[PDB]
Amino acid sequence: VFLGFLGAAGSTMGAASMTLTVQARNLLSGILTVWGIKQLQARVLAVERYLRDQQLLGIWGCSGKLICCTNVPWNSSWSNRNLSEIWDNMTWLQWDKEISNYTQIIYGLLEESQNQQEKNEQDLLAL
Amino acid sequence: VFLGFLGAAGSTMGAASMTLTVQARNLLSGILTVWGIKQLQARVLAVERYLRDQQLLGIWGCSGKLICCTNVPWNSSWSNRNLSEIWDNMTWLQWDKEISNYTQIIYGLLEESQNQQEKNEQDLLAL
Amino acid sequence: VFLGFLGAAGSTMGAASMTLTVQARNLLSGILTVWGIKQLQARVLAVERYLRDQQLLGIWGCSGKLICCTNVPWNSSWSNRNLSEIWDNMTWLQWDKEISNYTQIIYGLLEESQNQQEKNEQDLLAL
Amino acid sequence: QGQLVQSGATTTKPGSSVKISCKTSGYRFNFYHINWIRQTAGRGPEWMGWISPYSGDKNLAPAFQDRVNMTTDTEVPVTSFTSTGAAYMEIRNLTSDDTGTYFCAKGLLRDGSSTWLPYLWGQGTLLT
Amino acid sequence: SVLTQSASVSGSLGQSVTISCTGPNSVCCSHKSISWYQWPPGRAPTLIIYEDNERAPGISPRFSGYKSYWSAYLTISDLRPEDETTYYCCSYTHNSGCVFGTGTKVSVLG
Numbered sequence A, B, C: 001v002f003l004g005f006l007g008a009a010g011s012t013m014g015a016a017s018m019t020l021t022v023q024a025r026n027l028l029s030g031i032l033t034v035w036g037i038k039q040l041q042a043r044v045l046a047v048e049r050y051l052r053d054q055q056l057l058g059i060w061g062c063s064g065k066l067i068c069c070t071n072v073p074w075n076s077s078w079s080n081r082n083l084s085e086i087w088d089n090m091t092w093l094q095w096d097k098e099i100s101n102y103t104q105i106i107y108g109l110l111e112e113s114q115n116q117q118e119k120n121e122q123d124l125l126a127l
Numbered sequence D: 001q002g003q004l005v006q007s008g009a010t011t012t013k014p015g016s017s018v019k020i021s022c023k024t025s026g027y028r029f030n031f032y033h034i035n036w037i038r039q040t041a042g043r044g045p046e047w048m049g050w051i052s053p054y055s056g057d058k059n060l061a062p063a064f065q066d067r068v069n070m071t072t073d074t075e076v077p078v079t080s081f082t083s084t085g086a087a088y089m090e091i092r093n094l095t096s097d098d099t100g101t102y103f104c105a106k107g108l109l110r111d112g113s114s115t116w117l118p119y120l121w122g123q124g125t126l127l128t
Numbered sequence E: 001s002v003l004t005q006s007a008s009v010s011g012s013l014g015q016s017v018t019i020s021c022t023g024p025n026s027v028c029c030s031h032k033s034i035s036w037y038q039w040p041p042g043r044a045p046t047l048i049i050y051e052d053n054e055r056a057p058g059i060s061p062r063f064s065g066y067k068s069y070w071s072a073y074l075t076i077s078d079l080r081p082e083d084e085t086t087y088y089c090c091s092y093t094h095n096s097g098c099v100f101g102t103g104t105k106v107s108v109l110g
């Protein structure tokens, strides 16, 4: 099936996670007059917001990945939910709300876990 | 030899394929007055067209690659030409014309072949 | 310790090299009125300078890397300094001055060393 | 994570039919099946059937297929992820063998192998 | 019915019990899932363990499950005083229903 842009918004986190490229395509293209400056401001805004998400993927060792596995172990303080009660029960919309507070913390952990990982790889290849 | 920007435009697809970084460098740098707004419109246009090619490479698992090998098998309906009659006979200009129609189809195949590849890698590392 | 943006500017090249993500974060976000056009010109300038550094990392096989190891052997004409007298003696500021002349040469060597590396990998997978 | 209140103890006599309600809250009604289960005197517990408020689909045991009227309304949305629903249940050829406590149960998950499993229950209704 | 449990078993505080749940090849076990329910007398039940060994949310790690080719087992490690009730098992697949069991009363008198 082909649900469309945000088609799986109401589907479960597991279902939507197979339709990632759907939302990844339309993030950069889409699904001195008044309109002239109004459009230019939007064309620059789209690029800035895109490169910010790409910037975070880059410093997490996830550049080029849609599904990216990391080294940060899941702190149960963030959410003490079982695996089967998340990917087959919740929607990404609900999940983003429940992890609203802890999102900024995870973003830092994913960063130093990458600068230490490549610092280690620089030593693994020092022989 | 150093042919220059588009130097191998008339050379064979194999010859030009060794001079990829030549064309890759000058894709982003180059080889309220009237000119002021005329130049700003061009500086934004160059970035948008660049990130679109990078966006496609990213969702094909080719981000960072110049020569990228995939999993989509070559449908002979697209072109029933032999390997030696392409890379040592044709020029990329001719090739882009002969594959004009089927180009949009290949671009979709290269996308899901990557979202299924990483979905599989997420399972290979689930143990 | 957390020194901050450019905190290790006066520290040794080895110390600063562990604080790369610090400077990598604030390279894209930060640490028709007069101000309106003055700000738009800056928002475009920040993206162009960012993608230029990313463009060089891409054609060096370093896209996504903070510490990237290459194949170009260090020519002692560039700097005939010992390893321990660089990473534990000099600051990146001093180093950029001493390698000012030879920087453009290294940037070319890192490019063809990548187009030949992937051309070789295209043959390693031709069987 | 919500309540599934039911009707009162309506005691009739054999031959008649009884309609038991099940009004939901605190959760998206259309996202989970509504199971119907009874524990009568003479046997233990017996699973009657569930119905899918979203798809409208119904699956019930052969021991109650020709007796049970299983219908659902349509949820009245409260918030983005909350609604209020209602599930109905009737029985045709009623006897004294069918005397017991009846419950409704919300399904367990939205996917997987335990989608319809009676997880969140009501309070019970005493029949004849 | 056809899913015969363990009749009745007794126990003691601090100890662990084990309820059986077996039946013919038509309702057990390798080709079906096994769920366990704590059922007070004619009141509100409680899902304890679904899909053979997976525990429901909020269930204490005391309860554990296990299914063999012939029988499914429900253990209750470290008996606490609030455990006296009847325990029922159910055999099900993804697109089926619950084939409940005959029941097993558990006593903790100690």
Ligand SMILES: *[C@@H]1O[C@H](CO)[C@@H](O[C@@H]2O[C@H](CO)[C@@H](O[C@@H]3O[C@H](CO[C@H]4O[C@H](CO)[C@@H](O)[C@H](O[C@H]5O[C@H](CO)[C@@H](O)[C@H](O)[C@@H]5O)[C@@H]4O)[C@@H](O)[C@H](O[C@H]4O[C@H](CO)[C@@H](O)[C@H](O)[C@@H]4O)[C@@H]3O)[C@H](O)[C@H]2NC(C)=O)[C@H](O)[C@H]1NC(C)=O
Pocket (backbone or CB within 6 Å): A007, A008, A010, A011, A012, D030, D031, D032, D033, D052, D053, D054, D055, D056, D057, D058, D059, D107, D109, D110, D111, D112, D113, D114, D115, E094, E095, E096
């Ligand atoms: C929107 O939200 C609703 C509600 O949350 C979602 O509906 C739920 O979808 C999931 C997955 O799509 C369903 O879970 C599956 O359930 C089937 C059981 O169905 C089988 O049995 C039914 C009764 O006998 C029968 O009706 C089914 O037949 C088909 O035809 C009906 C016609 O009415 C059709 O409506 C059905 O959808 C069926 O297609 C069918 O025979 C179960 O088999 C599934 O398990 C299999 O697959 C999982 C993997 O997904 C696997 O792990 C299992 O081991 C097994 O292999 C699966 O559990 C759920 O029942 C739906 N209803 C609810 C939860 O109330 C809907 O999907 C959402 N859509 C979007 C776009 O977000």
Ligand SMILES: *[C@@H]1O[C@H](CO)[C@@H](O)[C@H](O)[C@H]1NC(C)=O
Pocket (backbone or CB within 6 Å): A074, A075, A076, A077
């Ligand atoms: C979880 O987070 C808290 C602070 O948010 C921290 O103190 C604790 O060590 C973390 N636990 C794990 C296991 O990471």
Ligand SMILES: *[C@@H]1O[C@H](CO)[C@@H](O)[C@H](O)[C@H]1NC(C)=O
Pocket (backbone or CB within 6 Å): A097, A098, A099, A100, A101
């Ligand atoms: C985040 O913090 C706010 C503080 O007002 C709190 O109300 C909220 O519950 C927190 N989020 C979670 C998921 O607990």
Ligand SMILES: *[C@@H]1O[C@H](CO)[C@@H](O)[C@H](O)[C@H]1NC(C)=O
Pocket (backbone or CB within 6 Å): B074, B075, B076, B077
């Ligand atoms: C080639 O493409 C056609 C449609 O364009 C498709 O039907 C056919 O299956 C394809 N063949 C192969 C081998 O991929």
Ligand SMILES: *[C@@H]1O[C@H](CO)[C@@H](O)[C@H](O)[C@H]1NC(C)=O
Pocket (backbone or CB within 6 Å): B097, B098, B099, B100, B101
């Ligand atoms: C593409 O389609 C057009 C339709 O007008 C056709 O003329 C053309 O030959 C097609 N391209 C190829 C390579 O066959």
Ligand SMILES: *[C@@H]1O[C@H](CO)[C@@H](O)[C@H](O)[C@H]1NC(C)=O
Pocket (backbone or CB within 6 Å): C074, C075, C076, C077
């Ligand atoms: C060092 O550079 C010079 C020119 O700058 C070159 O001629 C020489 O071959 C180089 N030596 C090595 C070892 O690369």
Ligand SMILES: *[C@@H]1O[C@H](CO)[C@@H](O)[C@H](O)[C@H]1NC(C)=O
Pocket (backbone or CB within 6 Å): C097, C098, C099, C100, C101
């Ligand atoms: C670079 O070239 C200039 C030429 O004026 C020279 O003075 C300078 O010393 C050179 N740099 C180094 C590091 O030698």
